[PDB]
């Protein structure tokens, strides 16, 4: 083709090449021009000339006002954070310091500062700098709760629905409950003065808080409330938040029929308003992969998670917590999908890169390691038992022991002793000690996980079924205690068959364990009939394997808002 370059794009190249002599005059440009010069500085590799301007609050403020080129801004901002300059903390400190000086100013300057703080904190929350976005939103909340005026409660609760968001992502769950209480206090003050504010965003973020804290019984009630507080006039981002978080709260409470409706509607809305290359659409893809992972549709979850990661590696760059979460989610999903195949090359690659990011941008005591390490300490187990070497097997099991111990220590530090995450770490440690030939510790950890999962989650749940499967696989294949292994296999197959129908993946593990159980003691009629059941299982699995890709399974406009919500709410009774 060989089109000539646009005079706008050609003058950008000329201005950038004369950047040093015209540093002060580029600040005197329209907001659309000023972004393109800085984006050209990013494209030319001059990140330090870029970073000397993005450290400033008011230059970055006009750069933030280009709403269409926010993906490019996220990419160059992540490039600066990978460059070495701490622009996320510099901008937060500059905003807080410049914003504490206008506490006694007029309402116009204060509301301008609140708007700039919303834009900047929303950017840092979308970029994943939750520790550096909390300070911005804390300063915003400080300036909102100064004057006793009507609109200040609205701005204060709008600050608090974002502090609770940036505290869930920062794993600061102990400040989350007090943030919810303070937001509810300003909602009470709003309701007394005859001004009811929408409660969907706060209730959604509280649902995310309680799901993260493994309080699914209360998180389900709070997502019911959040879905009740969805109206037609809500922003699409808030509706998508509530839908995806309610879907996560429904899939964890075995409400699979409701969860697919909510999450497919959320994916459709995210792809409709935002697009196929937006970070929020990637968030919906991550939650939809969580759904598909939790309904045994693992093969679609792998491709869905890879779609979420490819968007997050496109908008963002390298050492980002959002790319890290996409990696630790895809690594676990690939671990589940290739658990039988044994090809943990992609899974280990994604798990190793997930920890390589969080250990670089987050402190060593952060809870977000406890997930990622866990995933790696699963994959490193399966590679070790697949490898015929003994030295490599012992070393990999020792490394997995270190990762499980660190994750369990983080769970003890944050969630306590009787949490579902603690029970997951106990189950993983029991599996490891079964692989480590430490049989007594294996059964102790497994039975402790059984107790914690049964007293909190309940008897009829997926997690307790998986844990009794682990315990009786230890009993049958390894510990040679064949009596109670039969009871625990019967419990596991009962829960799995009632929860996922006849096509549950763990049914074949349980069936093989039960066949070995009987063949070690005789009773060949049981062996024959359960070999027949296993053959039926294989005949059912490959029949249901041929299901179309989940990206287009949600279709284009299958249903509408206030119909998914109504279908979810009227059946709650």
């Amino acid at each position: 083709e060989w089109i000539p370059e646009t005079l706008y794009n050609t003058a950008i190249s000329a201005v950038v090449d004369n950047y040093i002599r015209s540093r002060r005059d580029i600040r005197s440009l329209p907001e659309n021009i000023q972004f393109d010069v800085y984006y050209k500085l990013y494209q030319q590799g001059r990140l330090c000339q870029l970073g000397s301007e993005f450290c400033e609050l008011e230059v970055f403020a006009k750069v933030l006002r280009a709403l269409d080129k926010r993906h490019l801004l996220h990419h160059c901002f992540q490039a600066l954070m990978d460059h070495g300059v701490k622009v996320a903390s510099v901008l937060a400190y500059s905003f807080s310091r410049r914003c504490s000086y206008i506490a006694e100013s007029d309402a116009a300057v204060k509301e301008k500062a609140i708007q700039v703080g919303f834009v900047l904190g929303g950017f840092l929350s979308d970029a994943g700098w939750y520790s550096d976005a909390e300070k911005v939103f804390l300063s915003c909340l400080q300036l909102c709760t100064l004057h006793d005026e009507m609109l200040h409660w609205f701005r204060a609760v709008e600050c608090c629905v974002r502090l609770l968001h940036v505290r869930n992502g920062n794993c600061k769950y102990h400040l989350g409950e007090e943030t919810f209480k303070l937001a509810q206090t300003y909602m009470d003050k709003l309701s007394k003065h005859g001004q009811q504010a929408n409660k969907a965003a706060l209730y959604g973020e509280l649902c995310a808080l309680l799901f993260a804290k493994s309080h699914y019984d209360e998180a389900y009630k709070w997502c019911i409330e959040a879905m009740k507080e969805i109206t037609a006039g809500l922003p699409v981002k808030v509706v998508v938040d509530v839908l995806r978080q309610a879907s996560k709260a429904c899939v964890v409470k075995r409400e699979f029929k409701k969860a697919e409706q909510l999450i497919k509607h959320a994916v459709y809305l995210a792809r409709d308003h935002f697009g196929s290359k937006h970070p929020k659409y990637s968030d919906t893809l991550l939650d939809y992969g969580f759904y598909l992972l939790n309904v045994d549709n693992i093969c679609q979850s792998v491709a869905i998670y890879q779609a979420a990661l490819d968007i997050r590696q496109s908008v963002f760059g390298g050492k980002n917590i959002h790319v890290a979460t996409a990696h630790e989610d895809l690594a676990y999903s690939s671990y589940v999908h290739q658990y039988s195949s044994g090809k943990f090359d992609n899974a280990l690659f994604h798990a190793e890169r997930a920890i390589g990011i969080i250990t670089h941008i987050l402190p060593e005591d952060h809870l977000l390691l406890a997930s990622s390490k866990r995933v790696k300490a699963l994959i490193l187990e399966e590679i070790a038992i697949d490898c015929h070497n003994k030295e490599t097997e012992q070393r990999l099991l020792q490394e997995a022991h270190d990762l499980h111990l660190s994750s369990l220590q983080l769970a003890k530090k944050a969630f306590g002793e009787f949490n579902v995450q603690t029970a997951k770490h106990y189950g993983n440690l029991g599996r490891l000690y079964q692989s480590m030939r430490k049989f007594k510790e294996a059964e102790e950890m497994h039975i402790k996980a059984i107790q914690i999962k049964e007293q909190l989650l309940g008897q009829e749940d997926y997690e307790v079924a998986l844990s009794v499967g682990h315990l009786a696989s230890l009993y049958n294949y390894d510990m040679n205690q064949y009596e109670n292994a039969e009871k625990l296999y019967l419990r596991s197959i009962a829960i799995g068959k009632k929860l996922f129908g006849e096509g549950y993946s763990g049914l074949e593990y349980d069936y093989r364990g039960l066949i070995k159980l009987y063949n070690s003691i005789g009773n060949y009629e049981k062996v024959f009939e359960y070999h027949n059941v296993l053959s039926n299982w294989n005949r059912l699995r490959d029949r249901q394997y041929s299901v179309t890709d989940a990206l287009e399974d949600v279709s284009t406009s299958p249903q509408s808002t206030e119909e998914v919500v109504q279908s979810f709410l009227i059946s709650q009774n």
Binding site: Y335, Y339, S340, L378, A423, Q434, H470, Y477, Y509
Partner: peptide, 7 residues
Amino acid sequence: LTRNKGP
């Protein structure tokens, strides 16, 4: 393989 996947 003897056990199922990890939680």
